Write a protein that binds this ligand. Structure first.
Ligand code: MN
Lengths: 257, 91
């Protein structure tokens, strides 16, 4: 019943392009008819299958997130109830989906430099007492200024920090080797599932492409595994930073200018 | 036998192994320095059990030994190597 061309919130938004999501959520790209620009829309439970109090808690926690000002989360412009359960309106992020970018096979260093924005947002968010809910590839876009961003904010009761760490880790795996290493829920993202070892685990990115520096592969690999040492977004952020500095370009020294 | 001592109060040292020993900031350096001004592959020291021969791997910022800029240089006990804002003593 949500389809492209549909008008939402008293004709305020018109749906343009569907970008997936794991149910009960739907991620949409829409037109703000009153302001004549695009916005990101996250529909919470368009069909009304959740208990009211779950819907309530989702919108409450999502506002919590809206009070954070970091590049790695889109601005939440509005949170409303509509003829389609809850709605989270976010600013539109010029760029492309995580999927689109992964398919271009970006450089490992480029990829991990880009991820810091997400990891740092998770850190901030976790400190404010809320999760980002990186639960699906389609949550994430890469902006043309090179930040990986939560484009479709909507934090449900069961979301938690540990799963963000895996999600952010998985987003990195994706950029590295163009696969999603966590199990795929809801609407397929376009990322093929990762290749896996005899032991069950997803194959380490450096073992799929040995041009990937092992420190960078390591951040992805350890983030994504269950019993893996990485336990805070702060730690994750720091490992990424270090990985990045090891491979970054050299600072130039010269005499005074 | 030849040991390089990083002079940053960290007390880290590295003994040369026969053949190529890469010194730099990058991940496959034998002796790695987290100095942003140091190149990922900054210099190479070849060692054959007798002679430690240093060579600047076309680094961004150069390498001096005993306050003089070098390209290729045979090391001696006591030499001071400067790269980026780091210093390595040869002992
Ligand atoms: Mn209009």
């Amino acid at each position: 019943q949500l389809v492209p061309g549909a008008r939402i919130a008293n004709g305020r938004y018109r749906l343009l392009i569907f970008h997936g999501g794991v149910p009960p959520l739907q991620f949409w790209q829409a037109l703000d008819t009153a302001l004549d620009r695009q916005v990101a829309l996250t529909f919470v439970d368009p069909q009304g299958v959740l208990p009211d109090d779950v819907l309530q808690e989702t919108l409450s926690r999502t506002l919590r997130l809206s009070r954070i000002d970091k590049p790695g989360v889109a601005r939440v412009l509005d949170v409303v109830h509509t003829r389609a359960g809850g709605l989270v309106v976010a600013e539109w992020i010029r760029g492309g989906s995580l999927q689109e970018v992964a398919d271009t096979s970006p450089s490992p260093v480029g990829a991990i430099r880009a991820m810091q924005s997400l990891a740092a947002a998770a850190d901030a968010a976790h400190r404010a007492g809320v999760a980002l809910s990186i639960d699906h590839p389609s949550r994430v876009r890469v902006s043309i200024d090179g930040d990986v961003v939560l484009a479709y904010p909507a934090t449900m009761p069961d979301a938690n920090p540990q799963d963000d760490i895996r999600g952010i880790g998985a987003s990195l795996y994706a950029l590295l080797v163009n696969r999603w290493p966590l199990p795929e829920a809801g609407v397929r993202s376009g990322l093929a599932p990762a290749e896996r070892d005899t032991a069950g685990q997803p194959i380490e990115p450096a073992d799929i492409d040995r041009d990937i520096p092992f420190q960078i592969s390591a951040v992805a690999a350890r983030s994504v595994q269950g019993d893996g040492g990485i336990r805070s977004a702060s730690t994750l952020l720091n490992l990424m930073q270090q990985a990045t500095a090891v491979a970054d370009r050299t600072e130039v020294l010269g005499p005074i200018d | 036998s030849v040991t390089l001592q990083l002079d940053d109060g960290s007390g880290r040292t590295y003994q040369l192994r026969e053949g190529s020993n890469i010194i730099g900031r990058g991940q496959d350096a034998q002796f790695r320095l987290p100095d942003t001004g140091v190149s990922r592959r900054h210099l190479e020291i070849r060692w054959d059990g007798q002679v430690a021969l240093l060579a600047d791997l076309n680094s961004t910022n150069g390498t001096t030994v005993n306050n003089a800029p070098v390209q290729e240089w045979q090391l001696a006990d006591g030499d001071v190597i400067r790269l980026g804002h780091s210093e390595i003593i040869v002992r």
